[PDB]
A paper describes a structure:
The MuvB TF complex regulates cell-cycle dependent gene-expression and is critical for differentiation and proliferation during development and cancer. The core MuvB complex is composed of the five proteins LIN9, LIN37, LIN52, LIN54, and RBAP48 (or RBBP4). We find that the MuvB subunits LIN9 and LIN37 function as scaffolding proteins that arrange the other subunits LIN52, LIN54 and RBAP48 for TF, DNA, and histone binding, respectively. During quiescence and in early G1, MuvB binds to the retinoblastoma protein (RB) paralogs p130 or p107 (p130/p107) and E2F4-DP. This complex, known as DREAM, represses S phase genes and late cell-cycle genes.
We found that co-expression of RBAP48 with the DIRP region of LIN9 (LIN994–278) and the conserved CRAW domain of LIN37 (LIN3792–130) in Sf9 cells yielded a MuvB subcomplex that was stable through affinity purification and size-exclusion chromatography. We call this subcomplex MuvBN, as it contains sequences toward the N-termini of LIN9 and LIN37. The LIN994–278 sequence is almost entirely visible in the electron density and contains six alpha helices and the Tudor domain. Instead, they wrap around and from extensive contacts with RBAP48, create a binding site for LIN37, and anchor the Tudor domain to the rest of the complex. LIN9 and RBAP48 associate across a broad interface focused around the N-terminal helix (αN) of RBAP48 and the adjacent side of the β-propeller domain. The small structured LIN37 CRAW domain is bound between LIN9 α1 and α2. The LIN37 helix forms the primary interface between LIN37 and RBAP48. In contrast, the interactions of the insertion loop with LIN9 and LIN37 are much more extensive, and the entire loop appears ordered in the MuvBN structure. In contrast, the H4 site is bound by the sequence in LIN9 between α5 and α6 and is not accessible in the MuvBN complex. In the MuvBN structure, the H3 site is for the most part accessible, although the α1 and α2 helices of LIN9 pack against the edge of the propeller where the H3 site-binding peptides exit the propeller face.
Residue numbers in the entry:
A (entry chain B): 98 to 199, 214 to 220, 223 to 257, 262 to 274
B (entry chain A): 10 to 209, 214 to 411
C (entry chain C): 95 to 126
């Protein structure tokens, strides 16, 4: 009963104590406030689905059907290092686009936050926005010391 | 550390966003401990009237301050009648990351107690119940997993079915002879290759030890069509070809300087008698013809760090994959080597680079092609992730 | 059954010993 719950925790603690595994958890689920819109909406595939397959209302199809769709959309680029670089600086422009937008995009963040901190410490820790700074698009975060953090590494609440 | 991890994070989230153009199938699972080894068992269960088939994977653990295990896990893979949402990587609503087989969760079926980390684990072709394992104590261990309990003894005690001796140091190279039952090769840090004929107490001394290398012997593989032939690669930057019929086991039949740095892995083509590949710490994959090893047929250069594993596709003579510490798994099409490509395309790599898997967040220790589901690959990485994935059919067709 | 593990908490009572770690990591990473 509680023996089982405890054994589940032993398994969880063994993954999380490993720092590479620990950072994978950040990569998989941790999206800051400004990045959530950039990733949680429709992707280009879902956009193209909606626009060039307007009578397709289901989203549960077979590999073959999915294949017929992707062959209509043409061959993708190989995920080169150049490709990720072009995608990375597109992400930098999408961020500023969201930024100067300050109408269901996130509001600018005494807001309690979860922030990425590195070096000695290396988790996501809670704290307060001590100071906002639209200059370098950063926040001062005081942790439950004070650090200047990019906005794409700060999550509200 | 911040600059490297910001690039990795964004490039990983970018990859997820793009995963619907690139995969017929992507499944992300988190192991308790990272695995250094991964291999598809050859059996598949195809239940009557289901949209999934059942596959089995040989994995192991890598942990220093807990007990280790040889692991047999189960995977449910979709077939052609399976309907799933391929339109986006799900990470919130399911039990694996990505899209594909609803039922496609990895399940631990058997954990067997092991002496330290599982450096490598391979099943015997002539009897897939028999897995050989490479230990840090330098022994090679043999298990029939059907004769061990599903739950391992918590005392942690390792009781191999056979214990193969001959090495004085640990290693990673392991290869069963696909045309002679029970003939196993092993490559070790002790500079030696060890041979056993386990169709021979529970301890077995090596039948034969080959001593040509002068540094860590990284990898060894049997030739897949010639029962006497096998290859080896070592930290002496050499590829060596050995004939078990020869009376001299201190000198190979052939010995070429293969790369400009350590050579980590090799693999023979399952369709050609003459073709093989090596991967190197020099970030290269080299192609070789046995009829003249005096220089590479071809060098595949797109990797950005040490390559630690290469495997031919079991379904396609001209398809080859390689894996490295650059966190990438590359798939090559040999038939595309001289091809013309657009200047648009050339920025992403040579025409023989078929596909780049950017799904892994750390170094990839090992991967296996599925022998029953063409183009499906299982790959494991040092951050505990095990990914089961399949490149978009769109990519390897026209 | 809620535990604290490295500045984040997770109720492991909704899971079982057979649950794979992927969905448990998610609950560990999610917030309020």
């Amino acid at each position: 009963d509680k023996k089982a719950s405890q054994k589940i925790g032993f398994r969880l603690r063994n993954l999380l104590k490993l720092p590479k595994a620990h950072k994978w958890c950040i990569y998989e689920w941790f999206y800051s406030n400004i990045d959530k819109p950039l990733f949680e909406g429709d992707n280009d595939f879902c956009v193209c689905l909606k626009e060039s397959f307007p009578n397709l209302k289901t989203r549960k199809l077979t590999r073959v059907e999915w294949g017929k769709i992707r062959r209509l959309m043409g061959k993708p680029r190989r995920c080169s290092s150049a490709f990720f670089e072009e995608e990375r600086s597109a992400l930098k422009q999408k961020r500023q686009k969201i930024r100067l937008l300050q109408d269901e995009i996130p509001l600018p963040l005494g807001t309690k936050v979860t922030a990425r901190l590195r070096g000695v410490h290396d988790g996501l820790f809670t704290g307060q926005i001590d100071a906002v700074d639209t200059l370098n698009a950063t926040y001062r975060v005081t942790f439950d010391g004070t650090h200047t953090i990019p906005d794409y590494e700060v999550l509200s609440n | 550390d911040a600059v490297e991890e910001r690039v990795i994070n964004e490039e990983y989230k970018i990859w997820k966003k793009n995963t619907p153009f690139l995969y017929d199938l992507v499944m992300t699972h988190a192991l308790e401990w990272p695995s250094l080894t991964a291999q598809w068992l050859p059996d598949v269960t195809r239940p009557e009237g289901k949209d999934f088939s059942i596959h089995r994977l040989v994995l192991g653990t890598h942990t220093s301050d807990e007990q280790n295990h040889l692991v047999i896990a189960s995977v449910q893979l979709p077939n052609d009648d399976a309907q799933f949402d391929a339109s986006h990587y799900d990470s919130e609503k399911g039990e694996f990351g990505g899209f594909g087989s609803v039922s496609g969760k990895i399940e631990i079926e058997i954990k067997i107690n092991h002496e330290g980390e599982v450096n490598r684990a391979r099943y015997m072709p002539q009897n897939p119940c028999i897995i050989a394992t490479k230990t840090p104590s330098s022994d090679v261990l043999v298990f029939d997993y059907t004769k061990h309990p599903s739950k391992p003894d918590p005392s942690g005690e390792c009781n191999p079915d056979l214990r193969l001796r001959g090495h004085q140091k640990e290693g990673y190279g392991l290869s069963w002879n696909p045309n002679l039952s029970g003939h196993l090769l092993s490559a070790s840090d002790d500079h030696t290759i060890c041979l056993w004929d386990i169709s021979a107490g529970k301890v077995v001394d090596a039948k034969t030890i080959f001593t040509g290398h002068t540094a860590v012997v990284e990898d060894v593989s049997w030739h897949l069509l010639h029962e006497s032939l096998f290859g080896s690669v070592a930290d002496d930057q050499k590829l060596m070809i050995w004939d078990t019929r020869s009376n001299n086991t201190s000198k190979p039949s052939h010995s070429v300087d293969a790369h400009t740095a350590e050579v980590n892995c090799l693999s023979f083509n399952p369709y050609s008698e003459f073709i093989l590949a090596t991967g190197s710490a020099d970030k290269t994959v080299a192609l070789w013809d046995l009829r003249n090893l005096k220089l590479k047929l071809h060098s595949f250069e797109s990797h950005k760090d040490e390559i630690f594993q290469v495997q031919w596709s079991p379904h396609n003579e001209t398809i080859l994959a390689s894996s490295g510490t650059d966190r990438r798994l590359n798939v090559w099409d040999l038939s595309k080597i001289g091809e013309e490509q657009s200047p648009e395309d050339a920025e992403d790599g040579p025409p023989e680079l078929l596909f780049i898997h950017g799904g892994h967040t750390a170094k990839i220790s090992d991967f296996s092609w599925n022998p029953n589901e063409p183009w499906v690959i299982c790959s494991v990485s040092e951050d505990n992730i095990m990914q089961v994935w399949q490149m978009a059919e769109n990519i390897y067709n026209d | 059954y809620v535990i604290k593990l490295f500045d984040r908490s997770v109720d492991l009572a909704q899971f079982s010993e057979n649950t794979p770690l992927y969905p448990i990591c998610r609950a560990w990473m999610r917030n309020s």
